[PDB]
């Protein structure tokens, strides 16, 4: 199906405790494949998936160079942001950057991304046109002016339409055993009496990949959007994910409830019920 590549970056200042810590990770879809941590014993970008290990020493050298340079620009940027927001040097602040691309089943570019956040809030983002900017405030507008002057968007468009797509294609081929395999959820419903007149029905999805999934409870065919407790999809640690959806039902009415499961690993949506 469709695929994505993303590089995430986080620098966190710590005044009086040395220089900011820098951590960057790369993903293809929901698979971590590279990492770099500035606090590591001897910081290098490291592989985190088998299909990237075949890349030569030249690949790792170049990647590590970029990671180290990005740690440095983040340090400069954190200093710049203190100025832009008239902030003291006393506090810890956070700078985040994500960039990457989405491709369709045939490998064509769907969308490119390049965005920043400061202290957990939107800062500046490259628009979908890969040519214009959305700045969140007057500080971000200062960055926008600099980046428009330097024709940064044009550079990003070139990368996102070119190398991003091409290297994603390469990774998808090299990791075709895993990246191009969807694992369907293993599903079941559990029942737990709360009291004499109420019971919890919990619909489970386990062992699935990728993470995207929809779990919905129906009562007499009606979506129970507003009464369903839905946990955040969580990693099992073996590359697969887990999720559940729960409803509180009047006792004796269990069979009026159906759980519905949609996942790309499934040929068609599943319907299940509690099986006493």
């Amino acid at each position: 199906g469709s695929h994505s590549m993303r590089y995430f970056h986080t620098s966190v200042s710590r005044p009086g405790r040395g220089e900011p810590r820098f951590i960057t990770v790369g993903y293809v879809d929901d698979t971590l494949f590279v990492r770099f941590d500035s606090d590591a014993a001897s910081p290098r970008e490291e592989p985190r998936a088998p299909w990237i290990e075949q890349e030569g020493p030249e690949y790792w050298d170049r990647e590590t160079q970029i990671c180290k340079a990005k740690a440095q620009t983040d340090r400069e940027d954190l200093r710049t942001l203190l100025r832009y927001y008239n902030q003291s040097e006393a506090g810890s602040h956070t700078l985040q950057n994500m960039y990457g691309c989405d491709v369709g089943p045939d490998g064509r570019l769907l969308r490119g991304y390049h965005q920043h956040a400061y202290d957990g809030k939107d800062y500046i983002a490259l628009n979908e046109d890969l040519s214009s900017w959305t700045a969140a405030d007057t500080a971000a507008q200062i960055t926008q002016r600099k980046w428009e002057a330097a024709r940064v968007a044009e550079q990003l468009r070139a990368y996102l339409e070119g190398e991003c797509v091409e290297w994603l294609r390469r990774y998808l081929e090299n990791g075709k055993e895993t990246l191009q395999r969807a694992d369907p959820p293993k599903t079941h419903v559990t029942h737990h009496p709360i009291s004499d007149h109420e019971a919890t029905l919990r619909c489970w999805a386990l062992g699935f990949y990728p993470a995207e999934i929809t779990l919905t409870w129906q009562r007499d065919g009606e979506d129970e959007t507003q009464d369903t407790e839905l946990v955040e999809t969580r990693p099992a640690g073996d590359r697969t994910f887990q999720k559940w959806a729960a409803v509180v039902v009047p006792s004796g009415e269990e069979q009026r409830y159906t759980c519905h499961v949609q996942h790309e690993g499934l040929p068609k949506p599943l319907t299940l019920r509690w099986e006493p």
């Binding site: 710049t80 920043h116 800062y123 960055t143």
Partner: peptide, 9 residues
């Protein structure tokens, strides 16, 4: 692979 060129805000 990552974008080579540096960028500051």
């Amino acid at each position: 692979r990552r974008r080579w060129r540096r960028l500051t805000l």
